[PDB]
Amino acid sequence: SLSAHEIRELFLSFFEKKGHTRVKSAPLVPENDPTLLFVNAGMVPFKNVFLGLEKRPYKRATSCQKCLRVSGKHNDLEQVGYTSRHHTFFEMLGNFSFGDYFKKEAIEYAWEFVTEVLKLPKEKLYVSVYKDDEEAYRIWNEHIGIPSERIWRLGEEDNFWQMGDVGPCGPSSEIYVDRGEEYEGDERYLEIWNLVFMQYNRDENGVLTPLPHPNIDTGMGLERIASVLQGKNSNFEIDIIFPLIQFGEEVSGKKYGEKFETDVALRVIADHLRAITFAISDGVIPSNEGRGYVIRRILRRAMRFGYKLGIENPFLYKGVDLVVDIMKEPYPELELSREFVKGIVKGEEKRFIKTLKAGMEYIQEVIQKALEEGRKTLSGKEVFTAYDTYGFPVDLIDEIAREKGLGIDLEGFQCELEEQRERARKHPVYSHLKELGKTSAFVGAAAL
Ligand SMILES: Nc1ncnc2c1ncn2[C@@H]1O[C@H](COP(=O)(O)OP(=O)(O)OP(=O)(O)O)[C@@H](O)[C@H]1O
Ligand SMILES: [Mg+2]
Ligand SMILES: [Mg+2]
Ligand SMILES: [Mg+2]
């Protein structure tokens, strides 16, 4: 069945055998790249290798990179807690080939692990390849010997990965595990591995030119595949995250399997706990802008659902220990940051807790008040009060109102923001005008 810490260890040890020097996951905080707030894949730290800038001693490298999908174009923070497959923090596993082997090797080493290493029968496996990429279809169907009906040839939106507007990109291939007949869609056909084939380098005009030395990039979700092997139907039910859920059950008294708006918060605490744990360990302090404000948002949204559960006291600080204990094997580093990070998560809570509550009474007050006078949204002078007078993240104010079906007049919040940038300026983060709303959801009032 393999445990979480067993699958990760089987992955890295397996490819090491395939000539892949095991590398240590870089910190969630990008070293020399101010734009990319948080890492998001195993090829992030090696982005300068595929480019040809760096020349690591090894032509091959495997790693379990710590990822955080809460910024830029890959922002999942919204669906976190609403589904069973979306996390902020998550462990990505993968192999990378720096102009070494290619598709014929990337697949072989990818099929042996899934069948000869994960003990998943080859009768329920499924794969995908870029239709116009007969190169991969041959290896799969002909070489490896897989039936055609079990292979899908999709378009660009499904089988063509790119490293931005310009740079190395190319066709891809995904490995899907069939979960029976009781399920439907991407569930029954859970994506478990993403094999990316850097073949072409898109120029500034959108034209694709081949590379003289192709590359390989793979990203298998640890928690996601762990679900399969652990016969679970939720990434939140794995040996490493469930204890965190029950931790919520115990802090509130509530249990799993009853209401929808309850299982959510439970997943919210457990997930966000992982986020705010490794984050602070990798050098992030709750501030009012950029990275430092992403942790604060994640830590404040946990604070909210916790309060929605009835937990009227700082609790996440107790959850930091559980994480270190569950994650001290692959990342012993956390132990040293345990007490450290424990003081931080406890420091933030006792700071905003009193405000977080007062605010919940304010916001909810203008909710029923609004829907009575027939308003379908919250006024700009209302979401702002909660943003300033209460330090509530603008995204949170939105989620708190979205419950009753109410929205928030964007333009109002827009004008209201100008009514303060002109007021404060008449009677760090710099933001344009009319572009205030494209930054007000990522920076606090005190920093905006
Ligand atoms: N938030 C997440 N929580 C859990 N697993 C994830 C998450 N994001 C990605 N994964 C897993 O990591 C694998 C590699 O990431 P990839 O970039 O292919 O994801 P994706 O294209 O966003 O697909 P998906 O829609 O299933 O998240 C995915 O196939 C999936 O198994
Ligand atoms: Mg996705
Ligand atoms: Mg996909
Ligand atoms: Mg994918």
Strand content: 15-25%
Helix content: 40-55%
Number of helices: 14
**Cα distance spanning the termini:** 49 Å
CATH class annotation of the largest domain: Alpha Beta
User: How can the largest sheet be summarized?
Assistant: 10 strands, mixed
Q: At CATH's second level, what is the architecture of the largest domain?
A: 2-Layer Sandwich
C-alpha-based Rg, rounded: 23 Å
What is the approximate shape? globular
CATH superfamily of the largest domain: Bira Bifunctional Protein, Domain 2
Total number of distinct structural domains: 2
What small molecules does this complex bind?
Answer: adenosine-5'-triphosphate, magnesium ion
Number of extended strands: 14
Predict the CATH topology of the largest domain.
BirA Bifunctional Protein, domain 2
Secondary structure class reads: alpha+beta
Element-level helix/strand string: HEHEEEEHEHEHEEEEEHHHHHHEHHEH
EC number: 6.1.1.7
GO molecular function: alanine-tRNA ligase activity; aminoacyl-tRNA deacylase activity; ATP binding; tRNA binding; zinc ion binding
Main location: cytoplasm
Keywords: Aminoacyl-tRNA synthetase, ATP-binding, Cytoplasm, Ligase, Metal-binding, Nucleotide-binding, Protein biosynthesis, RNA-binding, tRNA-binding, Zinc
